[PDB]
Amino acid sequence: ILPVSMTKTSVDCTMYICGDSTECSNLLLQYGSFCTQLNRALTGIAVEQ
Amino acid sequence: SNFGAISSVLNDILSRLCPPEAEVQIDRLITGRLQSLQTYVTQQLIRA
Amino acid sequence: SNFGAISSVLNDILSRLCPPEAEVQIDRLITGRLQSLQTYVTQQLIRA
Amino acid sequence: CALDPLSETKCTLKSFTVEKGIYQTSNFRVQPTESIVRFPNITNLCPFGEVFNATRFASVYAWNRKRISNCVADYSVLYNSASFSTFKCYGVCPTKLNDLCFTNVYADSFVIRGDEVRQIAPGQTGKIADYNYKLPDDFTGCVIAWNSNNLDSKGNYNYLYRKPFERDIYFPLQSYGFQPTNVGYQPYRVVVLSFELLHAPATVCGPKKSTNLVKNKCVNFNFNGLTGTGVLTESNKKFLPFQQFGRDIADTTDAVRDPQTLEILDITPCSFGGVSVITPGTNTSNQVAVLYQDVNCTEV
Amino acid sequence: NDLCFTNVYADSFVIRGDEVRQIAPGQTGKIADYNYKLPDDFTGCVIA
Amino acid sequence: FNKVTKFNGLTVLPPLLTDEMI
Amino acid sequence: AYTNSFTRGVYYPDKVFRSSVLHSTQDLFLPFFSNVTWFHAIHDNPVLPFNDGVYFASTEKSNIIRGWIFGTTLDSKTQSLLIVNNATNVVIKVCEFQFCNDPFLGVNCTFEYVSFKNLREFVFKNIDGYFKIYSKHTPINLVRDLPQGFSALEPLVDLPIGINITRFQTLLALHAAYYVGYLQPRTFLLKYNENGTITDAVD
Secondary structure, three states: OOOOOOOOEEEOHHHHHHOOOHHHHHHHHHHOOHHHHHHHHHHHHHHHO | OOOOOOOOOHHHHHHHOOHHHHHHHHHHHHHHHHHHHHHHHHHHHHHO | OOOOOOOOOHHHHHHHOOHHHHHHHHHHHHHHHHHHHHHHHHHHHHHO | OOOOHHHHHHHHHOOOOOOOEEEEEEEEEOOOOOEOOEOOOOOOEOOHHHHHOOOOOOEHHHOEEEEEOOEEOOOHHHHOOOOOOEOOEEOOOHHHHHHOEEOOEEEEEEEEEHHHHHHOOEOOOOOHHHHOOOEOOOOOEEEEEEEOHHHHOOOOOOOEEOOOOOOOOOOOOEEOOOOOOOOOOOEEEEEEEEEOOOOOOOOEEOOOOOOOOOOOOEEEEEEOOEEEEEEEEEOOOOOOOOOOEEEOOOOOEEEEEOOOOOOEEEEEOOOEEEEEEEEOOOOOOOOOEEEEOOOOOOOO | OOOOOOOOOOOOOOOOHHHHHHOOEOOOOOOOOOOOOEOOOOOOOOOO | OOOOOOOOOEEEOOOOOOOOOO | OEEEEOOOOOEOOOOEEOOOEEEEEEEEEOOOOEEEEEEEOOOOOOOEEOOOEEEEEEEEOOOOEEEEEEEOOOOOOOOOEEEEEOOOOEEEEOOOOOOOOOOOEEOOOOOEEEOOOEEEEEEEEEEOOEEEEEEEEEEOOOOOOOOOOOOOEEEEEEEOOOOOOOEEEEEEEEOOEEEEEEOEEEEEEEEEOOOOOEEEEEO
16 A cells, blocks of 8 residues: 555635734735745645645 | 734734734734744645 | 843743743743754654 | 736736646635624613712722623723823723723722822832732733822822732831822822623623624624624524534634524635636737636636 | 935924823824824824 | 545645546 | 542533534643542531632432532621522622521622522632632432533533632521532543533543
8 A cells, every 4th residue: 555645735824824804914915925935835735746 | 822912813903902012913923823834834845 | 042032041031030021031032942943843854 | 916817827926928827826705795793782881980080089009999791881981081191001902992892891990199100000010019909911901090189189198008900908008198289299090991801791892883683695793892704694503501602623703692682693704715727828828717716606 | 314314294283291192103092083193104203 | 445534724626636537 | 428529520611612522621620530528418517618619519309408608707807608599599699797607598798699319510610700600400310429421510600709718618408418529720621512512521
């Protein structure tokens, strides 16, 4: 028996961090590209599965 | 988790506080939740 | 390492300061030491 | 970036050219249709005047404490008053108090010297802040204080001084030199309002009026100060008679009991999902297809 | 003295001394809730 | 197949090949 | 005398509905399998300590147990909480009472309120200036000892009395058996079922 793949996930890190608060979303932009590079890494994992 | 904020619920901070102090509380939640995702995505990259 | 606290010795903060300021100085040590473990455990997962 | 899905793709990629592929560009979320507001059907105006306009306050070593409950609190009446030399609040913003709603309020009341006002704050160090009266370091409340030289000076030896919210009655008990000639050496009155934010049924709530209740439609909402957004629905959640909110694994509310009639409402976030834009290359065509992820086509 | 600005503005008025408490970024009361307040990100000096 | 057995922005995407294609 | 509290004195820790979930919480709970003191309504109602809080229960068929007193000195030098079932309502007072040395129900008050085959279980705790009452009733057939099944107590009353307590005393109707166990700060894991009901726990 061999693992071949695993459950493909995407996490919308703006919705995870800020829960549809615009007040938090505007603060989260001050952290720059941390959220787009989290989505980029999870999308690389998902396409690889 | 609070990560040091007055509440772990973002709508508590936004319904109770106003911008000079609300942004101080929300940055603790952003820092801890962003560190929580960076931990998850790192361990999913290693598991992948 | 101090991580921006008054001392890295946790008992200096607790013997010299009192809770309103001691918890600010301790949370700098907790922040840096927790980041120090997350760095170690990530590099051990990669090395494993 | 909001012109069309290809423009949102170009913005997501930070690029004017787009290669062939499927790109996750945004999350689609249904916006709230209208805002519901819901508070207990109670109308008694709170007795704050019986604390603030009282003939004589107590001494700081033997401070008064009035429970406020089962009433409507227009904090604007206090907050807008020119009478107050300071009004500092902690864990709440004064502007939000009329939007907000508590299980009880405790109104502590006493007289101090004007020098000592600074000691009535969260977790302080000083002779008042240990031997007489102390606020928690995590205090949620307002400290409201003013000079009373026109009322409490004579000096007036009837005012005296020696853990959080502690009473304690040779002994270091001493009396103030309050004379009308005294500015920091004047008598000052202080009222401290402490707010009880437990998840029990709220009983001290702002004058902000309730709306009608809406079901099976996406709304913004406020129940007893619990703000949120979702499709409110009826539910089969068998809340026991004492239970007021329901929660999920994220430690977020997923049901509430309506404070005006005691039915149990489910809360669910409004229809939402990932948007992915399918495109040939922009070198091939500017046409695109859109995938609304996991939604049924009736939801779009 | 080591620094420049593109413009400077001197806002000027009289108040009762008790209202100096209201003249700060995001401070509040019957002057600031009506007719003069500083924004939460004010850059400048208050001189009284 | 028998012996093997989150509104918060977390989502699961389907695999490209369904079990019927595998 | 003593009996063993196998699984008794679990209660809903907060006013929040939870279902199909295991929740971990820290509170004053009666420890599992702890020996609880046992008393009989013959020859009695001493002044017990209250400690950090009390689980109380009566194995009953008669309704001879009808109230409780709480305070520090119980002698009018300070307030004392009194709780009585008047056979129609629970009546509650916090006056500076001067009780008997041997008080019974005959067959300056800052606050006031109104609202074997039987086991009645109660939990009393005095935290942050609130006196909190939880309870449950169940049928029983075991006469001598507490039942080895499971059931969770639900809040009846919560009173913002602000009073210090270190002693308490039950009240009997005069011209049955009961048990006392002190609460401890414990982490508990609580099994909320589909009907949002606590159905098992781990101390």
